[PDB]
Coordinates of C-alpha atoms and ligand atoms in Angstrom, one line a residue:
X1 CA -0.6 66.9 -30.6
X2 CA -3.8 68.6 -29.5
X3 CA -4.0 72.0 -28.0
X4 CA -5.8 73.1 -24.9
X5 CA -9.4 74.1 -25.3
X6 CA -9.5 77.0 -22.9
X7 CA -12.3 78.2 -20.8
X8 CA -12.5 80.9 -18.1
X9 CA -14.5 80.6 -14.9
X10 CA -13.6 84.0 -13.6
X11 CA -10.2 83.4 -12.0
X12 CA -6.7 84.3 -13.2
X13 CA -6.3 81.6 -15.8
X14 CA -8.2 79.1 -17.8
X15 CA -8.7 75.4 -17.6
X16 CA -8.4 73.0 -20.5
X17 CA -11.7 71.4 -21.3
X18 CA -11.7 67.7 -22.2
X19 CA -14.6 65.5 -23.2
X20 CA -15.4 62.1 -24.8
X21 CA -13.9 63.0 -28.2
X22 CA -11.3 65.7 -27.4
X23 CA -8.5 66.4 -24.9
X24 CA -5.2 68.3 -25.1
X25 CA -2.2 65.9 -25.7
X26 CA 1.5 65.6 -26.6
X27 CA 3.4 64.2 -29.5
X28 CA 5.9 61.6 -28.4
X29 CA 9.1 63.0 -26.9
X30 CA 11.7 63.6 -29.5
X31 CA 16.7 67.5 -29.7
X32 CA 20.2 67.5 -31.2
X33 CA 23.4 68.3 -29.2
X34 CA 23.8 72.0 -29.2
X35 CA 20.1 72.7 -29.0
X36 CA 17.7 72.9 -26.1
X37 CA 14.0 72.1 -25.7
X38 CA 11.7 74.4 -23.8
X39 CA 8.2 73.6 -22.4
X40 CA 6.3 76.8 -21.3
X41 CA 3.1 77.3 -19.3
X42 CA 1.7 80.8 -18.7
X43 CA -1.1 82.3 -16.7
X44 CA -2.1 83.9 -20.0
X45 CA -3.0 80.6 -21.6
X46 CA 0.1 78.8 -22.8
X47 CA 0.0 75.1 -21.9
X48 CA 3.3 73.2 -22.0
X49 CA 4.1 74.6 -25.4
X50 CA 7.1 73.0 -27.0
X51 CA 9.8 75.3 -28.5
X52 CA 13.5 74.9 -29.2
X53 CA 16.5 77.2 -29.3
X54 CA 20.2 77.0 -29.7
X55 CA 22.9 76.7 -27.0
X56 CA 25.4 79.5 -27.3
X57 CA 29.1 78.9 -27.0
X58 CA 29.8 82.3 -25.5
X59 CA 28.2 84.7 -23.0
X60 CA 28.7 88.4 -22.4
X61 CA 26.9 90.5 -19.8
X62 CA 25.9 90.8 -16.2
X63 CA 22.2 89.7 -16.2
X64 CA 21.1 86.7 -14.1
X65 CA 23.2 83.6 -14.6
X66 CA 22.3 80.1 -13.2
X67 CA 25.3 77.8 -13.4
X68 CA 24.7 74.0 -13.6
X69 CA 26.8 72.0 -11.1
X70 CA 26.9 68.5 -12.8
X71 CA 29.2 67.1 -10.2
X72 CA 27.2 68.1 -7.1
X73 CA 25.0 65.0 -6.7
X74 CA 22.0 65.0 -4.4
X75 CA 19.0 62.7 -4.0
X76 CA 17.7 60.3 -6.7
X77 CA 14.1 60.5 -7.8
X78 CA 11.4 57.9 -7.1
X79 CA 8.6 59.7 -9.0
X80 CA 5.3 61.6 -9.3
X81 CA 1.6 60.8 -9.1
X82 CA -1.6 61.0 -7.2
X83 CA -4.1 59.2 -5.0
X84 CA -6.7 56.8 -6.3
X85 CA -9.3 57.6 -3.6
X86 CA -12.9 56.4 -3.6
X87 CA -13.9 59.9 -4.6
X88 CA -11.5 60.0 -7.5
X89 CA -12.4 56.6 -8.8
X90 CA -16.1 57.4 -8.4
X91 CA -15.7 60.6 -10.4
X92 CA -13.6 59.1 -13.2
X93 CA -16.0 56.1 -13.8
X94 CA -19.0 58.3 -13.9
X95 CA -17.8 59.7 -17.3
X96 CA -18.3 57.8 -20.5
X97 CA -15.6 55.3 -21.4
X98 CA -14.0 57.3 -24.1
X99 CA -13.7 60.3 -21.8
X100 CA -12.4 58.0 -19.0
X101 CA -9.6 57.0 -21.3
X102 CA -8.6 60.6 -22.2
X103 CA -8.5 61.4 -18.4
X104 CA -6.3 58.4 -17.7
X105 CA -4.2 59.2 -20.7
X106 CA -3.6 62.8 -19.4
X107 CA -2.0 61.4 -16.2
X108 CA -0.5 58.2 -17.1
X109 CA 0.6 58.2 -20.8
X110 CA 3.5 59.6 -22.7
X111 CA 0.8 61.6 -24.4
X112 CA 0.0 63.1 -21.0
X113 CA 2.2 63.9 -18.1
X114 CA 3.7 60.4 -17.4
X115 CA 2.7 59.8 -13.7
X116 CA 4.5 56.7 -12.2
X117 CA 3.1 56.6 -8.7
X118 CA -0.3 55.8 -7.3
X119 CA -1.3 56.2 -3.7
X120 CA -4.1 53.8 -2.8
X121 CA -6.0 54.0 0.5
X122 CA -6.6 50.8 2.4
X123 CA -10.3 51.1 3.0
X124 CA -12.2 54.3 3.6
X125 CA -10.8 57.8 4.3
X126 CA -12.7 61.2 4.1
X127 CA -12.8 61.0 0.3
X128 CA -15.1 58.0 0.5
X129 CA -18.9 58.2 0.6
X130 CA -19.3 55.8 3.5
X131 CA -17.1 54.5 6.3
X132 CA -15.9 50.9 6.1
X133 CA -12.8 48.8 6.8
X134 CA -11.9 45.5 5.3
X135 CA -12.7 43.7 8.6
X136 CA -16.0 45.1 10.0
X137 CA -17.1 41.9 11.7
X138 CA -16.4 42.7 15.5
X139 CA -13.6 40.9 17.3
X140 CA -12.6 38.9 14.2
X141 CA -9.0 38.5 15.4
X142 CA -8.2 36.0 12.8
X143 CA -9.6 38.2 10.0
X144 CA -11.7 35.4 8.7
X145 CA -14.2 37.9 7.2
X146 CA -11.5 40.2 5.8
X147 CA -12.6 41.2 2.2
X148 CA -12.3 43.9 -0.4
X149 CA -15.5 45.9 -0.9
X150 CA -16.8 47.1 -4.3
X151 CA -14.9 50.3 -3.8
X152 CA -11.8 48.2 -4.5
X153 CA -13.1 45.5 -6.8
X154 CA -15.3 47.6 -9.1
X155 CA -13.7 51.1 -8.9
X156 CA -10.1 51.5 -7.7
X157 CA -8.5 48.2 -9.0
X158 CA -9.9 48.2 -12.5
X159 CA -8.9 51.9 -12.8
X160 CA -5.4 51.1 -11.6
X161 CA -5.0 48.2 -14.1
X162 CA -6.0 50.6 -17.0
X163 CA -3.5 53.2 -15.7
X164 CA -0.7 50.6 -15.7
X165 CA -1.7 49.4 -19.2
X166 CA -1.5 53.0 -20.4
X167 CA 1.8 53.9 -18.8
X168 CA 5.1 53.3 -20.4
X169 CA 7.1 54.2 -17.3
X170 CA 6.8 51.4 -14.7
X171 CA 4.3 52.5 -12.1
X172 CA 4.7 52.1 -8.3
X173 CA 1.7 51.6 -6.0
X174 CA 1.7 53.1 -2.4
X175 CA -0.8 52.1 0.2
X176 CA -1.9 53.9 3.4
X177 CA -4.6 53.0 6.0
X178 CA -6.7 55.8 7.7
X179 CA -8.4 53.6 10.3
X180 CA -8.3 50.0 11.5
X181 CA -11.5 48.2 12.2
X182 CA -13.2 49.9 15.2
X183 CA -13.0 46.9 17.5
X184 CA -9.2 47.2 17.4
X185 CA -9.5 50.7 18.8
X186 CA -9.7 52.1 22.3
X187 CA -12.7 54.4 21.3
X188 CA -14.6 51.9 19.1
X189 CA -15.2 54.5 16.4
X190 CA -13.7 55.2 12.9
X191 CA -12.8 58.7 13.9
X192 CA -12.2 60.6 17.1
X193 CA -9.3 60.5 19.5
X194 CA -8.4 56.8 19.7
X195 CA -5.6 54.3 19.1
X196 CA -5.0 50.6 18.9
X197 CA -6.0 48.8 22.1
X198 CA -3.4 47.3 24.5
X199 CA 0.2 47.6 23.5
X200 CA 2.8 46.6 20.8
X201 CA 3.5 42.9 20.5
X202 CA 0.0 42.1 21.7
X203 CA -3.0 40.6 19.9
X204 CA -4.6 43.9 18.9
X205 CA -1.3 45.0 17.4
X206 CA -0.6 41.6 15.7
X207 CA -4.1 41.6 14.2
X208 CA -3.5 45.0 12.7
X209 CA -0.1 44.0 11.4
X210 CA -1.7 41.0 9.7
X211 CA -4.3 43.2 8.2
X212 CA -1.6 44.9 6.1
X213 CA -0.6 41.4 4.9
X214 CA -4.2 40.5 4.1
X215 CA -4.6 43.7 2.2
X216 CA -1.5 43.0 0.1
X217 CA -2.7 39.4 -0.4
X218 CA -6.1 40.5 -1.7
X219 CA -4.5 43.1 -4.0
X220 CA -2.0 40.5 -5.3
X221 CA -5.0 38.3 -6.2
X222 CA -6.1 41.0 -8.6
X223 CA -2.5 40.9 -9.9
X224 CA -1.3 44.2 -8.3
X225 CA 1.9 44.4 -6.2
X226 CA 2.9 47.4 -4.1
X227 CA 6.1 49.3 -4.0
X228 CA 5.5 50.7 -0.5
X229 CA 3.1 51.1 2.4
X230 CA 2.9 53.8 5.1
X231 CA 2.7 52.9 8.7
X232 CA -0.5 54.9 9.1
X233 CA -1.9 58.0 7.5
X234 CA -1.4 61.0 9.8
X235 CA -0.8 59.1 12.9
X236 CA -1.0 62.4 14.8
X237 CA -4.6 63.0 13.9
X238 CA -5.9 60.2 16.0
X239 CA -4.6 61.8 19.2
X240 CA -6.9 64.8 18.8
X241 CA -10.2 65.0 20.6
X242 CA -13.1 65.0 18.1
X243 CA -11.0 64.5 15.0
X244 CA -13.8 64.4 12.4
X245 CA -12.9 61.5 10.1
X246 CA -11.1 58.2 9.8
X247 CA -7.9 57.9 11.8
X248 CA -5.8 55.9 14.2
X249 CA -3.6 57.7 16.7
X250 CA 0.1 56.9 17.3
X251 CA 2.5 58.8 19.3
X252 CA 6.0 58.5 17.9
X253 CA 6.9 55.9 20.6
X254 CA 3.7 54.0 19.8
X255 CA 4.7 54.0 16.1
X256 CA 8.3 53.1 16.9
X257 CA 7.3 50.1 19.0
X258 CA 4.5 49.1 16.7
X259 CA 6.9 49.0 13.8
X260 CA 9.7 47.2 15.7
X261 CA 7.4 44.7 17.4
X262 CA 4.6 43.9 14.9
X263 CA 4.4 45.5 11.5
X264 CA 8.1 45.0 10.6
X265 CA 8.4 41.4 11.5
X266 CA 5.0 40.6 10.1
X267 CA 5.8 42.2 6.8
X268 CA 9.3 40.6 6.7
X269 CA 8.1 37.1 7.3
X270 CA 5.5 37.3 4.5
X271 CA 5.7 37.0 0.8
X272 CA 5.6 40.8 0.6
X273 CA 9.0 41.4 2.3
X274 CA 10.3 43.5 -0.6
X275 CA 7.5 46.0 0.0
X276 CA 9.0 49.1 1.6
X277 CA 7.7 50.6 4.8
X278 CA 7.5 54.4 5.2
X279 CA 7.0 56.0 8.6
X280 CA 5.3 59.3 9.6
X281 CA 3.1 60.1 6.5
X282 CA 2.2 63.3 8.3
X283 CA 2.9 67.0 8.4
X284 CA 6.6 67.9 8.1
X285 CA 6.3 69.9 11.4
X286 CA 6.6 66.6 13.3
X287 CA 10.2 66.5 12.1
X288 CA 12.8 65.9 13.1
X289 CA 11.4 64.6 16.4
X290 CA 9.4 61.7 15.0
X291 CA 12.4 60.6 13.0
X292 CA 14.6 60.7 16.0
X293 CA 12.2 58.7 18.1
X294 CA 11.8 56.0 15.5
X295 CA 15.2 55.7 13.8
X296 CA 17.4 55.9 16.9
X297 CA 16.0 52.5 17.9
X298 CA 17.8 50.0 15.7
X299 CA 14.9 47.4 16.2
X300 CA 12.5 49.8 14.4
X301 CA 15.0 51.4 12.0
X302 CA 16.0 48.1 10.4
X303 CA 12.4 48.0 8.9
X304 CA 11.9 51.6 7.9
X305 CA 12.9 52.5 4.4
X306 CA 11.9 56.2 4.3
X307 CA 9.9 59.0 5.8
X308 CA 6.7 60.1 4.2
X309 CA 5.6 63.8 4.6
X310 CA 2.4 65.8 4.0
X311 CA 1.9 69.4 2.8
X312 CA -1.0 71.7 3.4
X313 CA -0.4 74.0 0.6
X314 CA -2.6 76.7 2.0
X315 CA -0.3 77.3 5.0
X316 CA 3.5 77.2 5.1
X317 CA 10.1 76.5 7.2
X318 CA 11.6 73.4 5.6
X319 CA 15.3 73.4 6.5
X320 CA 14.6 72.9 10.2
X321 CA 12.4 69.9 9.3
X322 CA 13.4 68.3 6.0
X323 CA 16.9 69.7 6.3
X324 CA 17.7 68.6 9.8
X325 CA 16.0 65.2 9.2
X326 CA 18.2 64.5 6.1
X327 CA 21.3 65.5 7.9
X328 CA 20.5 63.1 10.8
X329 CA 19.4 60.2 8.7
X330 CA 20.9 60.8 5.3
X331 CA 20.2 57.2 4.1
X332 CA 16.5 57.3 4.9
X333 CA 14.7 58.9 1.9
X334 CA 12.2 61.7 2.4
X335 CA 9.1 61.3 0.3
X336 CA 6.1 63.7 -0.1
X337 CA 3.1 61.3 0.1
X338 CA 0.3 64.0 0.1
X339 CA -0.2 67.6 -1.0
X340 CA -3.1 70.0 -1.4
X341 CA -5.0 73.3 -1.5
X342 CA -8.7 74.5 -1.0
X343 CA -9.3 75.4 2.6
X344 CA -8.5 79.2 2.9
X345 CA -11.9 80.1 4.4
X346 CA -12.5 83.0 2.0
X347 CA -12.0 81.0 -1.2
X348 CA -13.9 78.2 -2.9
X349 CA -12.7 74.6 -2.4
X350 CA -12.3 74.4 -6.2
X351 CA -11.3 77.5 -8.2
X352 CA -11.4 76.5 -11.8
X353 CA -8.5 78.1 -13.6
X354 CA -6.5 79.2 -10.6
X355 CA -3.0 80.1 -11.6
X356 CA -2.1 80.7 -7.9
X357 CA -2.9 77.2 -6.8
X358 CA -0.8 76.0 -9.8
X359 CA 2.1 78.1 -8.7
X360 CA 1.7 76.7 -5.2
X361 CA 2.1 73.2 -6.4
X362 CA 5.4 73.6 -8.3
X363 CA 6.8 76.0 -5.8
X364 CA 6.3 73.2 -3.3
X365 CA 7.6 70.5 -5.6
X366 CA 10.8 72.7 -6.0
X367 CA 11.3 73.4 -2.3
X368 CA 11.0 69.6 -1.8
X369 CA 13.5 68.8 -4.5
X370 CA 15.8 71.4 -2.9
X371 CA 15.5 69.5 0.4
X372 CA 16.3 66.0 -0.7
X373 CA 12.8 64.8 -1.0
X374 CA 12.7 61.9 -3.6
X375 CA 9.2 61.9 -4.9
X376 CA 5.9 63.7 -4.9
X377 CA 2.3 62.5 -4.7
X378 CA -0.7 64.6 -5.2
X379 CA -3.9 63.9 -3.2
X380 CA -7.2 63.0 -5.1
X381 CA -6.5 62.3 -8.8
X382 CA -9.9 63.9 -9.7
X383 CA -12.8 65.5 -7.9
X384 CA -16.2 67.1 -8.7
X385 CA -16.8 70.9 -8.9
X386 CA -17.8 71.0 -5.3
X387 CA -14.5 69.4 -4.4
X388 CA -15.7 65.9 -3.5
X389 CA -17.6 63.8 -2.8
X390 CA -16.5 63.8 0.8
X391 CA -18.7 62.3 3.6
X392 CA -17.5 64.8 6.1
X393 CA -17.8 67.7 3.6
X394 CA -14.0 68.2 3.8
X395 CA -13.8 69.4 0.2
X396 CA -10.6 70.5 -1.6
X397 CA -9.2 71.1 -5.0
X398 CA -7.8 68.5 -7.5
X399 CA -5.7 68.9 -10.7
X400 CA -8.6 67.4 -12.7
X401 CA -12.2 68.3 -12.0
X402 CA -15.0 66.1 -13.4
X403 CA -18.3 67.5 -14.4
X404 CA -20.6 64.4 -14.7
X405 CA -23.6 66.2 -16.1
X406 CA -21.7 67.4 -19.1
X407 CA -19.5 64.3 -19.5
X408 CA -16.6 66.9 -19.3
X409 CA -13.5 67.2 -17.2
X410 CA -11.3 70.2 -16.6
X411 CA -7.5 70.2 -16.3
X412 CA -6.5 72.9 -13.9
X413 CA -3.3 74.9 -13.9
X414 CA -2.2 72.6 -11.0
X415 CA -2.2 69.7 -13.5
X416 CA 0.2 71.5 -15.8
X417 CA 2.4 72.7 -13.0
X418 CA 2.8 69.0 -11.9
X419 CA 3.4 68.1 -15.5
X420 CA 6.4 70.3 -15.8
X421 CA 8.0 67.9 -13.3
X422 CA 6.4 64.5 -13.8
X423 CA 6.6 64.4 -17.5
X424 CA 10.3 65.1 -17.7
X425 CA 12.0 63.6 -14.6
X426 CA 11.9 59.9 -14.7
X427 CA 12.6 57.6 -11.8
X428 CA 16.4 57.5 -11.5
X429 CA 16.8 61.2 -12.2
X430 CA 19.3 62.8 -9.9
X431 CA 19.0 66.3 -8.5
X432 CA 22.2 68.2 -8.9
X433 CA 23.5 71.7 -8.3
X434 CA 22.3 75.0 -9.6
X435 CA 23.8 78.1 -8.2
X436 CA 22.6 81.6 -9.0
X437 CA 24.9 84.5 -9.9
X438 CA 22.8 86.9 -7.8
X439 CA 19.6 87.3 -5.7
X440 CA 16.6 86.9 -8.0
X441 CA 12.9 86.0 -7.6
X442 CA 13.0 82.8 -9.7
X443 CA 12.5 79.3 -8.2
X444 CA 14.6 76.7 -10.0
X445 CA 15.9 73.2 -9.6
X446 CA 18.2 71.2 -11.9
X447 CA 18.5 67.4 -12.3
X448 CA 20.2 64.9 -14.5
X449 CA 18.1 62.3 -16.3
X450 CA 19.3 58.7 -16.0
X451 CA 20.5 58.9 -19.6
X452 CA 22.9 61.7 -18.7
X453 CA 20.9 64.7 -20.2
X454 CA 19.7 67.8 -18.3
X455 CA 16.4 69.0 -16.9
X456 CA 15.9 72.4 -15.3
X457 CA 12.7 73.8 -14.1
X458 CA 12.4 77.5 -13.7
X459 CA 9.3 79.0 -12.0
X460 CA 8.5 82.7 -11.9
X461 CA 6.0 83.8 -9.3
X462 CA 6.5 87.5 -9.8
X463 CA 4.8 89.6 -12.4
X464 CA 8.0 90.8 -14.0
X465 CA 9.7 89.1 -17.0
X466 CA 13.2 87.9 -15.9
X467 CA 15.8 87.6 -18.5
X468 CA 18.4 84.9 -17.8
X469 CA 21.1 82.5 -19.0
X470 CA 21.9 79.0 -17.8
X471 CA 25.5 77.8 -17.9
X472 CA 26.4 74.2 -18.4
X473 CA 30.1 73.7 -18.8
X474 CA 29.6 70.6 -21.0
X475 CA 27.7 72.5 -23.7
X476 CA 27.5 76.3 -23.4
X477 CA 24.9 78.8 -22.5
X478 CA 21.1 79.0 -22.7
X479 CA 20.0 82.6 -23.3
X480 CA 16.4 82.7 -22.3
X481 CA 13.9 84.8 -20.6
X482 CA 11.3 83.8 -17.9
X483 CA 7.9 85.6 -18.4
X484 CA 6.2 86.8 -15.3
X485 CA 3.8 84.2 -14.0
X486 CA 5.1 81.2 -15.9
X487 CA 6.9 77.9 -15.4
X488 CA 9.4 76.4 -17.9
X489 CA 11.0 73.1 -18.1
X490 CA 14.3 73.2 -20.1
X491 CA 15.8 70.0 -21.6
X492 CA 19.1 69.6 -23.4
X493 CA 21.4 66.8 -24.2
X494 CA 25.0 66.8 -22.8
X495 CA 27.2 64.6 -25.0
Ligands
LIG501 C1 -15.9 68.0 -27.1 O1 -15.1 69.2 -27.2 C2 -14.7 69.4 -28.5 C3 -13.6 70.4 -28.5 O2 -14.1 71.7 -28.1 C4 -15.9 69.8 -29.3 O3 -15.6 69.9 -30.7 C5 -15.8 71.2 -31.1 O4 -17.2 71.4 -31.3 C6 -17.6 72.7 -31.8 C7 -19.1 72.6 -32.1 O5 -19.3 71.4 -32.8 C8 -16.8 73.2 -33.0 O6 -17.1 74.5 -33.4 C9 -15.3 73.0 -32.9 O7 -14.7 73.1 -34.1 C10 -15.0 71.5 -32.4 N1 -13.6 71.4 -32.2 C11 -13.0 70.3 -32.7 C12 -11.6 70.2 -32.8 O8 -13.8 69.4 -33.0 C13 -17.1 68.8 -29.1 O9 -18.3 69.6 -29.3 C14 -17.2 68.3 -27.7 N2 -18.1 67.2 -27.6 C15 -19.3 67.4 -27.0 C16 -20.2 66.1 -26.9 O10 -19.6 68.4 -26.5
LIG502 C1 -18.1 35.4 8.0 O1 -17.7 34.4 7.1 C2 -18.4 33.1 7.2 C3 -17.6 32.0 6.6 O2 -16.4 32.5 6.1 C4 -19.8 33.3 6.7 O3 -20.6 32.2 6.6 C5 -20.5 34.4 7.5 O4 -21.6 34.8 6.8 C6 -19.6 35.6 7.9 N1 -20.1 36.1 9.2 C7 -20.5 37.3 9.1 C8 -20.8 38.0 10.5 O5 -20.7 37.9 8.1

């Protein structure tokens, strides 16, 4: 174990300072039947502290009671992680090797928060320091000059390998393109309003479908295989006049037909047919309409494994989107493929120590779990103090901020708020019921670990301490209390 080295930067909480020779860490997971484990993080400085208490056989009183519903079974969990963008890899590798390993350990190791997903962009997005695709030779329909640049061969891929080496959980890779080569596009530019030329089934559309295959082929050459790909990052962006950075517009009908006609068959007839395809990969406000358009066409649906969703954590309904969508296509998983904060005009892109941005992460993770979402992926794994680099200056926050000049990195509250989920909810976990005995201000979600034991996260975004008890009929009652401005993960064995 190693405790947080705290440092204040003038906001509501501290960051934990890590460097080449030190970084906060866990002991390996260890609790007997009849006892419960509690991980606590507080605005006042506690960082996933471990403590244990007994489970009571009896309970008197009329304070808040949350009853576990073991037998109400909801979605199963895919996992948790972040994006290996050019900017993140760039920042990580600018540190000294020993510090690089602590950073990777904090995310990917049982000594850290056990991430098991990595989103990887296919070529450049806005967190890149130059625009480029894998096929920048014009009119190269055959993709003869398709190749991975150094951004993949010297930064992302090696970093990915090391993450996998460090992880004990099996890790899944997820890939998303921002833009195709510009000669495949009506506007001939990496950004701006513009889409694939011609129409689905045609040679522009076939070339693009093969580009996915070539991407996967090249990655498979560096011994990496993907769990899933998205059909396109924020397809809706490329429909917007003057959109500032890399994009490719699809209407839902364009996406439907492109999937049915080109990308589905192409992927299916290739050695990567077990790779899953997710559609949308955009704001949840495009639901349920996008889902309806794509899935009620059997020729497209037969290829679509799930629906990927984005969150701008600064803004903010979910039931009329996630809810309705799940209702309509219960067997098509919802998956959060991107989240983030740092745009509220009045506040810095990176606020070091921000407990509020922390709360925003887990509040969102919980709302997602409550609406059937099966996994959650943060945006940039790491960023500099300015919130980049980003070639369009589109800076934002990241759970780990790298300070190259001091060979230091900072773990923000956000990190720990993620940790309260990622570290304790392995793939296979199943969300189950948790009913409250009365209106309260807590946020809480309960799941069952594959092994049969229980996880419950309780978040408290008010300033008041909230005393409460959790009933599980198999074992008894957890008397506990939830400190204002805190998040707890509770674990206890069930048989
Ligand atoms: C990395 O950070 C660690 C932890 O803060 C630093 O080690 C501390 O250094 C100061 C000054 O030497 C001591 O007062 C503390 O007792 C140390 N803590 C521990 C547990 O060693 C170390 O200085 C940092 N490394 C660099 C290069 O700055
Ligand atoms: C494309 O590849 C060919 C052979 O594969 C190579 O000789 C040539 O330099 C490349 N053409 C361009 C435009 O780079």
